[PDB]
Structure 1
Amino acid sequence: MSFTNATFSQVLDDLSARFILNLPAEEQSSVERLCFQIEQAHWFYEDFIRAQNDQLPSLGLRVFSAKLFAHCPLLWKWSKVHEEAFDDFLRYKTRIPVRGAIMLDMSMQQCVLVKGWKASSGWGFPKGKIDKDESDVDCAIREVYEETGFDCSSRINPNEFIDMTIRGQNVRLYIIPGISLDTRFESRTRKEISKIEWHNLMDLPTFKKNKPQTMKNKFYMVIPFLAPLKKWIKKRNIANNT
């Protein structure tokens, strides 16, 4: 309800004062700290602000950073001398690799979401950090089996996924369609999640621009993946009927 009628310049005004403008003197001069807040501002824009206003476009980390710098003249002095040092850091920063899975039903209109125990823990896709010497596919299989009890070893495809760097994490969620709706999900392996329920894709905020956006339930790192997932399912239904 906050950013329902907010222009893109006002959104950049808010994220500027909220994240990067009011840091102490020594923190603003730090490339690491300034980049850290921009990544947080990007995640805050994708996960929260876009859900309240579908008119705002979905942007990548590097694209969002460029528009925010030109928006605020207070960073024009900084970005002019620290241009090469920031662009090299924004690309080559060591980020936490997180792997997961977007399990869809046979009709590809319902997905599996998981929720934690905390009161503010929102729904999200089953994902988690990678271990040492672990493969990308092996990490996604482990996190799904631990958080949902389902073994997607025989169904996961290393080429069907959505990769995105958000909030300082290299996230890759493997799209797995055709999951039976009668699957009994028992997360006995990990007691840090509470519920595992199928969610209609049309009920998520940004998936259905025609539907009235009502956000009664909380979602964490689900909205930014809806735009590629909507494009992914659109190409699969065409490829299935060609």
Structure 2
Amino acid sequence: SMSFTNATFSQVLDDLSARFILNLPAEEQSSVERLCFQIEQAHWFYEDFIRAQNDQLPSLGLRVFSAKLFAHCPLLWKWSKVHEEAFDDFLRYKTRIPVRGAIMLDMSMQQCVLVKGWKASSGWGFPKGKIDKDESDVDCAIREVYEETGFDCSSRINPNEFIDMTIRGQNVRLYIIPGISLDTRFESREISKIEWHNLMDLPTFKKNKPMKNKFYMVIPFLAPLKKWIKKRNIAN
């Protein structure tokens, strides 16, 4: 889409407020938990879609974005100081579903492995999944990478190199694994395709660049990933 390419930040807050918050049934509006659900959905919508159309919009933490949204909408101002206190305690301290995955980079750290599902609405994304019971984070990442890409990363995954992100009510952690050979043959055991994507071709990675593709939960990680690659290059 192009609907937000020329939108101001205030217009974006208006769109998100009408899209996610304003028109809920009163039962949903009174509940703190439902309201957090909607704000998280709007936050993920902002990061994953709206920021892609316009990189002049800044990436915001869930707490900062939720604060700006609370200030923007006068209807939301019905919430009291004590109730915004307790609400921010819930959002900040809400237990979210843990999902773990990997960002697999080539030897030159210029391309990454992405997977796409069967549906036309299914977009490209990092291999990742929801953690099982009594499963460790690293084991969850290795398991999901094996199930989706068929690549065994247990000998190359680094438990101390990962990107944490709280988005769409999920605690996402993606372990960064560089040095993967482009000759790697990938196969799954429900994945439409596994492919290498150039990092600069991905939306918002380059400084000023235009290319229509659909991605899911990829744009939020590109700034930390870019930083990480710059540091690793600086070491080498």
TM range (shorter): over 0.9
Q: What's the offset of the Cα at 1:80?
A: 2.6
CA contact (8 A) 1:102 1:174 kept: yes
Q: Equivalent pairs: percent with the same residue?
A: 99
Change (3 A) 1:79 1:4: farther
Q: What's the offset of the Cα at 1:111?
A: 0.2
Change (3 A) 1:5 1:79: farther
Per-residue Cα deviation, 1:164-191 (whole angstroms, up to 9, x for no partner): 110000000000000000000011xxx5
Give the secondary structure class of the aligned counterpart of 2:208: coil
Q: What's the offset of the Cα at 1:79?
A: 4.2
Per-residue Cα deviation, 1:189-241 (whole angstroms, up to 9, x for no partner): xx5211001000011111012222xx4211000000001001110111001xx
Gaps of 5+ in 2: none
Per-residue Cα deviation, 1:18-76 (whole angstroms, up to 9, x for no partner): 10011111111110111100000000000000000010001111111011001111111
Segment of structure 1 superposing worse, 80-89 or 40-49: 80-89
Paired with 1:72 and 1:9, the residues of 2 have a C-alpha distance of: 10
Would you identify which runs of 4 or more consecutive aligned residues in structure 1 move more than 6 Å? none
Aligned partner (choices 196, 199, 222) of residue 197 of structure 2:
199
Per-residue Cα deviation, 1:146-171 (whole angstroms, up to 9, x for no partner): 00000000110111110011000000
Paired with 2:192 and 2:108, the residues of 1 have a C-alpha distance of: 26
Give the secondary structure class of the aligned counterpart of 1:18: helix
Paired with 1:151 and 1:85, the residues of 2 have a C-alpha distance of: 44
Give the secondary structure class of the aligned counterpart of 2:60: coil
Paired with 1:204 and 1:42, the residues of 2 have a C-alpha distance of: 20
Segment of structure 1 superposing worse, 70-79 or 26-35: 70-79
* Two-structure CA RMSD over aligned residues (Å): 1.0
Change (3 A) 1:79 1:105: farther
Give the secondary structure class of the aligned counterpart of 2:114: strand
Give the secondary structure class of the aligned counterpart of 1:5: coil
- Number of residue pairs aligned between Structure 1 and Structure 2: 235
Give the secondary structure class of the aligned counterpart of 1:82: helix
Give the secondary structure class of the aligned counterpart of 1:44: helix
Paired with 1:210 and 1:87, the residues of 2 have a C-alpha distance of: 35
Give the secondary structure class of the aligned counterpart of 1:233: helix
Paired with 2:55 and 2:158, the residues of 1 have a C-alpha distance of: 31
Gaps of 5+ in 1: none
Give the secondary structure class of the aligned counterpart of 1:113: strand
CA contact (8 A) 1:69 1:79 kept: no
Paired with 2:183 and 2:204, the residues of 1 have a C-alpha distance of: 27
Paired with 1:76 and 1:176, the residues of 2 have a C-alpha distance of: 45
Give the secondary structure class of the aligned counterpart of 2:113: strand
Aligned partner (choices 203, 216, 226) of residue 230 of structure 1:
226
Give the secondary structure class of the aligned counterpart of 2:192: strand
Give the secondary structure class of the aligned counterpart of 1:176: strand
TM (normalized to structure 1)?
Answer: 0.95
